[PDB]
């Protein structure tokens, strides 16, 4: 992977190239309001330590940071999310895995069209990485989900169980 970050919009400003995952753009950039994936798929995080909101970013060029959804021009980390070769996800109506349950292996710009429910109180991310969005389209606030078990929706960095869509991370 590789990403080129710009303090201003068009691909102005001081700028900053990073191969690999970074927990702290403090020193190297001021602020973040253009950008250009050159390849890989990347998270950019408002705070450092990949905290705070979370922003998905593929092979292409954003002018602003209105591009990647970005309430601010703050990012202050960034981590280049793992290939994988096969996605599988498990989402459940209830936690630890309980109550009715839906598998996907593909993208889903509307949840609710799916399994008609508004919140997803645990998942299971068998196979590759995905995002979750807040609303539908993939709007709203986004949740980068890694292999692994979310007994509760705290476990994907969420105030609340809501989920619209979901989104295979996939480079081209």
Not at 6 to 12: A, C, I, L, P, V
Not at 78 to 92: A, E, F, K, Q
Not at 100 to 126: A, G, K, P, W, Y
Request: charged content about 25%; some cysteine; hydrophobic content about 25%.
């Amino acid at each position: 992977g590789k990403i080129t970050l710009y303090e201003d919009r068009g691909f102005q400003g001081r700028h900053y190239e990073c191969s690999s995952d970074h927990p702290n753009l403090q020193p190297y950039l001021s602020r973040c309001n253009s950008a250009s994936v050159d390849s890989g798929c990347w998270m950019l995080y408002e705070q450092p330590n990949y905290s705070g909101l979370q922003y998905f970013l593929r092979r292409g060029d954003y002018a602003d940071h209105q591009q990647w959804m970005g309430l601010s021009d703050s990012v202050r980390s960034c981590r280049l999310i793992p290939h994988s070769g096969s996605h599988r996800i498990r989402l459940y109506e209830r936690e630890d895995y309980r109550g009715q349950m839906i598998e996907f292996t593909e993208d889903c710009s509307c949840l609710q069209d799916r399994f008609r429910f508004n919140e997803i109180h645990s998942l299971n991310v068998l196979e590759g990485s995905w995002v979750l969005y807040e609303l539908s389209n993939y709007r709203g606030r986004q949740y980068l989900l890694m292999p692994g078990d979310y007994r509760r929706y705290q476990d994907w960095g969420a105030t609340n169980a809501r989920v619209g869509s979901l989104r295979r991370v996939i480079d081209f």
